[PDB]
Design a protein around this ligand. Sequence first.
Ligand code: ZNH
Ligand code: ZNH
Ligand code: ZNH
Ligand code: ZNH
Ligand code: NA
Ligand code: NA
Ligand SMILES: [Zn+2]
Ligand SMILES: [Zn+2]
Ligand SMILES: [Zn+2]
Ligand SMILES: [Zn+2]
Ligand SMILES: [Zn+2]
Ligand SMILES: [Zn+2]
Ligand SMILES: [Zn+2]
Lengths: 157, 157, 157, 157, 157, 157, 157
Amino acid sequence: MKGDTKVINYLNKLLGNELVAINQYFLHARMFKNWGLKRLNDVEYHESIDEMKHADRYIERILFLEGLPNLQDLGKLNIGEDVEEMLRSDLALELDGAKNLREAIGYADSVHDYVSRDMMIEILRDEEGHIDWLETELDLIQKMGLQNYLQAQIREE
Amino acid sequence: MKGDTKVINYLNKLLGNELVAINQYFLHARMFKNWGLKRLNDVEYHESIDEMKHADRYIERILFLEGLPNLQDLGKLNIGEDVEEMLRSDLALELDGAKNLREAIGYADSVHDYVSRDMMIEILRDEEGHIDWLETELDLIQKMGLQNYLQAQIREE
Amino acid sequence: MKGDTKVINYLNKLLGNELVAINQYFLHARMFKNWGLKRLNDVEYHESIDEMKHADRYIERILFLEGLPNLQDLGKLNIGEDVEEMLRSDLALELDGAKNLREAIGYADSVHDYVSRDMMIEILRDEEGHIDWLETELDLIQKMGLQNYLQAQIREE
Amino acid sequence: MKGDTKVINYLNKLLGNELVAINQYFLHARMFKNWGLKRLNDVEYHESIDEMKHADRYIERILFLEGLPNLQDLGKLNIGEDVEEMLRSDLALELDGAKNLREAIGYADSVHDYVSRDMMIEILRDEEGHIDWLETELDLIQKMGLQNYLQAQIREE
Amino acid sequence: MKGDTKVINYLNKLLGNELVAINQYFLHARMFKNWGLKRLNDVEYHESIDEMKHADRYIERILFLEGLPNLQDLGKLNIGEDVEEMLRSDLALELDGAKNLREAIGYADSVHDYVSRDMMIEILRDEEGHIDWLETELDLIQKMGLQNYLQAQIREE
Amino acid sequence: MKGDTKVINYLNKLLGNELVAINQYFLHARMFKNWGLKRLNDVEYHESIDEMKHADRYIERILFLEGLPNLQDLGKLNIGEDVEEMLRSDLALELDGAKNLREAIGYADSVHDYVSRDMMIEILRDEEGHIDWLETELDLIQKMGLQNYLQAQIREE
Amino acid sequence: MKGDTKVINYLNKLLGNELVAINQYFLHARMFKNWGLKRLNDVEYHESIDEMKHADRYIERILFLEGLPNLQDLGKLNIGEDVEEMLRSDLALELDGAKNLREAIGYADSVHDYVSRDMMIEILRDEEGHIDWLETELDLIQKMGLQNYLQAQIREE
Ligand code: ZNH
Ligand code: ZNH
Ligand code: ZNH
Ligand code: ZNH
Ligand code: NA
Ligand code: NA
Ligand SMILES: [Zn+2]
Ligand SMILES: [Zn+2]
Ligand SMILES: [Zn+2]
Ligand SMILES: [Zn+2]
Ligand SMILES: [Zn+2]
Ligand SMILES: [Zn+2]
Ligand SMILES: [Zn+2]
């Protein structure tokens, strides 16, 4: 079913955001696991899976709308080297992705692509949940100190 | 445990092969799904997942060996527009990847990194299974013709 | 218990037929499997196992009758290169084997080896079932054409 | 997938060794069974089946590599006439076959056919297990004498 | 249904053989049991029951054919006084019985009493199993010696 | 089966490494248990058990190859007196053992003892897992400080 | 809790005896297993485990008493080359061990370390069970002869 060209372009841009997040959150997860921080491995791994699910929804929607999903262009990752830096990088990526989602959601409404809009709002709610988790962890590092914070990540929850 | 620098370079090269194949096989699968070819979606999706598992193994091994996994550089996808072209592109990608695996396996043995060698040989066996499946489907297209072949893909197996 | 020398010679000839058929039907099955013709692999494999069971019966009977089972001399296999040729070759093998079985059954009766005769009649009944299957498939190839016939072999039944 | 011609030639030689062992160990089993030595029938039958499994692995591998499995040429069996002679003949055959396996494993490595090599190492491990069983039974015959040894084979284990 | 007079005569002769074997095998079993040879009691008792079943088949067939089953004229038993002698006497009785069966089967076929023929062939197959067991035990006595053979009979199998 | 004398010598050297590690890891475990560090007792005890399993594999292999397992010569333990020292000592022991494994694996390949090679590579994979765990615990001691690290060992995981 | 210095010296001496027995009984078990003497492998393996449990009891008791367990100084093994020699060597080792235990038990009582005393008496009771089993097997070898004795060890009990 032919979709709106600019909607398809937004969906491809948001798919690009998810592709960056998939890789960044998966590498962060395995870095945490290598450091013995099993709780952070578990959470970041499941954030990666969530982004994979999002990417799948975009791919399927683009194809239904008769556009070409772009999995070729991968944006810049910002991996980082210690826990706080890694979480702050994930948070900045999420916040950037949320701005793009808000823009796309507004436009999808204007062209009456309400099914695309509805899909994107669900994704946005998911991203706001990741933001909450990231902001909270970063606050916990400040409130309890890094040593105590790291001790709290050794065991699965 | 400090690994050999060139082993790490090989693992990063092979990781890059898997990242290409993950994206190419996932997009092909959802294109098959959008065309109603459920059997092909199922197989190609599970091939994508297999490549993901391989990527995970490389990432963890690189990190154990104290290298930096490279998820930033994504090589060229070759998506293609019809079933035969898509399967032939996947086959070409697998064969290129097997050549790279063979080279890396020999080098790993020469520097006595037998655990990396053993991991890669397991991955190579997986890839040769994918090659077998692809070659066989391509032969079936020729033997029964495309119309009969497509009809055989509608229902799940 | 001492058996009749010519009966033992017939049992060794029949054992020789089964040994050819075991190898021909097993290789045919794995050729079909390699071509993705799962249904054909399944039937031909079970035909191979049936022949193995027959060979076992002859070996045990020969030994009971104080003869020497001959597993050294293997007759000529006719493998063939395409589905129809392979099935026709199996059909010819079965029909030759039934001729020999009929001759031996008649002779066993003449020397009063009724237990050997009864064993061979059960084996002949099995062989006539294989003949039926093979003749029917060859007719189906003609009635539906090779393309449709091959498509019908892709999935297990 | 096109294999190396010499590898395929090795696989066919090893297949030939398996085909000899299948027949020799199966006849030995049924000879043991006819003599009432149920424990030896059970073990030798299960060695025969194991060789059948190995032959299947070679057949499928050869076909994948686009070669022609040779089930027509059957080497020399050495049946023998009493328990010790039969076990020693099986041992000599296994030792000959292990020699050919080591040669093929080394060559498969040199041409980078690591999957064929990995298959053959698993088979070699199986053969070394049979060698252990045979050497141990032969030593037991000497240590307890043949009469006691035979008595210990009447009952299944 | 009026049967052939000579068929009935043969069935009564065979019934006579069965009645001898019932008593001889039952007495042998209880002799083995009294000597503590539990395995031999078990086998010979079950041979006796088998002969009882055969006798029942003859009695019923004779009555259907409007003849008179003769359970009055018991033939000569040969009991024997040690294990080998007892087993050799059972073997001689079975072999005599098989000879009579072969003659009766041929005659029944000649007068077209195919049901009686088929019954007798099933019985002959049972008898040939008894011959196999007896010949094998006698060979085992020779191969392991009587002392070891007897030890092997103490425990139920 | 007559094994290569220098393979047996390597297997005895590796067995020697395992015998040292069994004792050092078992004593470390019970020292941790005495200190109330139940998590470290659990891990070190299971490392000791792993080494016992490795030793059993070397002993059985040596005996199959017709050599003499040497359990008499026990190399130098380095027990240590505090948690970090104990873990550094276990790590040094593992790294020395991995070097010997790599040397032995290369040699076994050169004399075509592929089954011993394959056994050793599996053991090496296990040792690299132990190395990973030890390195990570030592990094955690630095990252969270010893007080927090000790607190994290009180409870079983 | 600070123990008596000489009690700790005795516990280390007894621990030393246990460490000799662990290795000797484990190697003997696998020698029996390699020879096909499954019953002897089973018993001697479980004697080895028993000694391991004893060693663990000594190690833990030494640590509680604030001493240093000595796992470094392995005493002399006497392996032996045939079944009777191996069993007699185990018996001599056990008897030497019992003598040391009796001395240690008396001394522990004299310095009022009744818990160490009670631990050692339980261990001595275990050792006296091993002596009983060993003395009995050695007498059985004499009473039935070695050939029959060995036959009795083939099957698990
Ligand atoms: C790159 C990098 C990467 C990696 C490493 C991965 C990995 C992974 C893993 C491990 C898993 C799990 C699986 C199993 O079962 O095991 C998954 C899943 C997964 N995944 Zn993915 N991935 C990825 C990417 C991806 C992408 C890009 C996509 C899109 C395109 C995806 C889509 C996916 C899906 C859909 C899934 C499933 C999910 C669920 O859970 O359901 N993915 N993954
Ligand atoms: C020749 C001679 C001979 C004989 C007698 C036999 C016999 C036999 C028997 C009896 C059995 C069982 C099965 C049932 O019953 O179910 C078998 C199985 C058998 N088999 Zn096989 N074989 C043989 C050869 C053979 C060969 C040659 C091969 C390949 C080629 C085989 C492959 C086989 C298989 C695959 C099987 C299945 C096994 C299992 O179980 O898994 N095989 N085999
Ligand atoms: C002769 C004629 C005759 C006949 C026909 C008979 C027949 C008979 C029958 C059918 C039965 C059932 C079987 C089943 O079910 O498995 C019996 C049982 C019988 N039986 Zn018997 N018998 C007889 C004689 C006899 C004698 C003579 C004796 C003694 C010796 C006997 C002893 C007997 C016994 C013991 C039994 C088991 C019983 C019960 O129930 O428990 N018996 N058998
Ligand atoms: C010396 C020091 C020592 C000690 C203290 C010990 C102790 C012990 C214990 C406690 C246990 C557990 C037990 C139960 O639970 O029942 C064991 C086990 C044990 N173990 Zn060990 N060990 C030892 C050495 C050893 C050696 C040296 C070897 C080799 C030779 C062994 C081999 C062993 C085995 C095989 C086992 C079983 C394992 C499993 O888990 O499966 N081992 N170990
Ligand atoms: Na069609
Ligand atoms: Na005896
Ligand atoms: Zn997302
Ligand atoms: Zn892959
Ligand atoms: Zn047949
Ligand atoms: Zn084999
Ligand atoms: Zn009867
Ligand atoms: Zn180890
Ligand atoms: Zn002890």
